[model samples]
Target: NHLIDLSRYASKINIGSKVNFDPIDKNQIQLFNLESSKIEVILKNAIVYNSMYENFSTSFWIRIPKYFNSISLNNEYTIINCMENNSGWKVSLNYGEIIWTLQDTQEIKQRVVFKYSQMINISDYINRWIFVTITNNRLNNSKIYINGRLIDQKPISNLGNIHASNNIMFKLDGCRDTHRYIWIKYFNLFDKELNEKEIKDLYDNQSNSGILKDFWGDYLQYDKPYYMLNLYDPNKYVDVNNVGIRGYMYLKGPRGSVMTTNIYLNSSLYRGTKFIIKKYASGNKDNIVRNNDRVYINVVVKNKEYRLATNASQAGVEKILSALEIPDVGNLSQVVVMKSKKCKMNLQDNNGNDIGFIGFHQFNNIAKLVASNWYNRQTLGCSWEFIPVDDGWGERP
Candidate 1:
């Protein structure tokens, strides 16, 4: 959510002196004239508190007119100044390029500057509604986006602390002159740094205004532990003998029930290619263990599928996978799992529609059911996370 939205403010008044406005659009505000006049909106209240200065983002829709050519050479126009004397964060334009600067007030102060060029004629954006967004993520990185596309990014070297400021001013004019004219449809200030998807979604659905609450949906909150293992290995089986295991496949028969007795590599043909769980060790001797048994849950390589295994009864494992929203057959991307962690689905009902409390909990439940099956100091839980075994596997931010 934004800390402040300038579009919500109406009326023809300035901080100290009054200004005139001939409002054209319902949400747009027209300011300045052909003469050298500047528009200043100052908020005396402290925008960045001590605890919240680490990350922030600013976004707005600005329309650049042809009249901006009146500016002299090598001159800069101030768009926003969060501190006096330009000692803190500031955004400006110099020769049709954006120059963003940040200066900290710590003893060993740090100042970081990020510049972005159009690489083409500035007229490409002239007389167009350009969406500009800038974000400062802690002292780690700074990003600038134009029209929902990232133009430039720079990493900060020093751990700089932002100088606390009680006022934030927007002076849409050249430092020495005010002959420039621009229309700002809306201005938004957010306390947190938005990601690429969030920024793109905001730009795509501009009609939603500034608030993007529940854009991704709900999530199950908890500390997730990641286990990195090779997909094509015999030792990468997900152990399900832990006591607190929950969501997992379980086999129910005519007289008894078995919740996955063992998971390991099987078959001389498919060994090391996929994982297989044994439901019945041997024919009527279900209580006794053997080498040959019915494969209940077959975890195959991401894309490949065995015909007989697919036709085999999958009623036991389908519900849990569906509840987790895992595809019936395919490689689960890292982003998909991360999205689930942010917004968890509430599973209710038992007819394979919705079950009570499904997620990592369901996986954990399966572990405890086959507690004795996992005796190799292996760990198990209702839910598990995937980690790339090699650098080529990549990761999520």
Candidate 2:
């Protein structure tokens, strides 16, 4: 959305090199109607300074809207004499007399210099358009550009604050006195500085109708009224919502243990290519240090039983967890694993024989027991622990 459009009103008022007036007295001169044009009214005044004048400056009256954050100045100039304090132009934004100056310090008698706020030097003049862009965003980092070339940069101290309706002014020809005549043409006012591309484009087509085509396009769309609101109480958002579970834990334990009545399996839900189990550490614990805990996983494949196992050990716990791969159960009755205080075990259908054996632990505490299709069952229980002599090694139950 455009913030303003100045095209429609540019024709209604007298612009170009033929206009000159005091911008502070609004009633004395008519502004290019900016309501719909979006183009800010650029006020220009001609002043004759004597060589013996001191601190002679010109001020403009500007009634800024409450929504505007900053302002900018655009112009073209030619310097005739390079004196100590008479070679630069000072610009003031929002009422205060304090100014940001662009000048040449070299003791040259007759040299034309372009005045841009970012840099302070005559070398910036490249027979092209120039602009001085300044921002009030605390940093006071102002820039000066000639045509598209950057000439100088300076950091201003304690740049004054901006207020709505503050009067803006300009000082030229001399700092404390006006001892010479400075000619300023194509003076323009913008809410922001034109980028290098924009400056070049404008200079290239200063009189082209295309320049005004999108001039205020950004203003019109952005100036429309809009509404924003917070649905919840302003200060009570954090106090209203309930916090969910804090830590992560798996729904079931390892593959096999005891198939308790509460641990019945639904083959439709449990028969999957893989099962994921996440381990949660106990309170204030940094590592899994407990000795003999067990995990029980129960399976019901076509009404038969099977199991897989998980065991945590000290020296080779990672290796044990990595070795538990579920066997391919083509059409087995059931398959599950039981993790006990002793060792991790998986119930396998070995030639129609129900055999349970220890499984290996994999890295990141993963245990898989590859079984047949008959191993569709549920998990019974899970914990951590050591191996039992009868259950091959340490198992979880």
Candidate 3:
């Protein structure tokens, strides 16, 4: 029997590797980790979309239920699988070392392997929970810690920033290519880098619970600056944190690629149609279109770039573009889709950030016009003309 507890955050636990452990009462996790089961949690935004500057820290737990005498040190247990690129970080246990690897820039690579002052192989500490923390502050100083004790620290010499690639994923508990059963619980990410002392304090104090309740912190509910996902949720979707914005998650990765954040399933296989819906929009400028029609716009998703099949005949897309005077070649930020009859799809060329949302009647007419030869900039098909989300987007359906 195994489990996890994500009832709190920051001062407590969070998504991805909120693989909570070292609980006062075994962390009193009630969520079981069956050998053949899986869990997926969505974090629409983690790190305040901090791509330009890589000042951040992460806290989480790793536990191996019962380390059999047969467990081999050669086995590697991946604690977190978010780094799907050379510009990302991956932390795992292999033989005698607890390694943390990352690519701060497209060309720079970095890693920290925590070695014991003595000869304590990573496999020696098993059957119990252990705390692992990583901090790379704005100053470019990096630190690796276990149970609040700094085991490794040095100057971070590299581009020092990870790519927010639409293709990367934050996968947890994917101990692939290894031969060991592992479990991860509580997880947390601080938008700002915390000094070693502050990191230790967070380690010492079990929790404060709901520390950041509003955006910008206390003055309001939408002013804080952070992003998070706690798996102990009441639903399966992007769990918006205090500071981040909401987003629509379109499953856009390889079928067998392991999943971590924003989902909880045995595999990435789509069980059936309508079980999921994929879209194709975004990209490029100038083309050959004399009238109102389109194959699709090209934006990217998960890993594969998509040109979601679209047609104005379901409604009237050609005339709508002409009426809006939208150039054939332009970068599209938003494209509206519908599951009804009068029209199947319509498009938008948002020259500005999302703000106002036209109601359905307006959309119905424009879609109607895409079918007709008239000007159309109307639709009330609402989706947060401002969800404030991005490519790191994932969902738990």
Best of the candidates, lDDT: 1
**Model 3: how far residue 366 lies from native, Å:** 93
**Winner of 2 and 3 under TM-score:** 3
lDDT of 1 by residue, 260-337 (tens): 112111111111222222232233332221222222233333333221111112235323332112243333211111
Using TM-score as the measure, the top candidate is 1
Candidate 2 structure quality by residue, lDDT tens digits, 339-367 = 32223334433243433333221225523
Summarize candidate 3's per-residue lDDT along 316-396 as a digit string, tens digits.
Answer: 323222111124223433344321211223444344222112222224322211222221333222211111121112223
Return the candidate ranking by lDDT, descending.
1, 3, 2
Stretches > 4 Å off in candidate 1: 1-4, 7-22, 33-46, 49-53, 67-71, 106-123, 157-159, 173-178, 207-397
Candidate 1 CA-lDDT value: 0.40
Clashes of 1: 20
Candidate 3 local Cα displacement, residue 195, angstroms: 1.9
Candidate 3, residue 383: the lDDT equals 19
User: Which consecutive 10 residues in model 1 have the weakest lDDT in total?
Assistant: 212-221
Candidate 1 lDDT score at position 379? 22
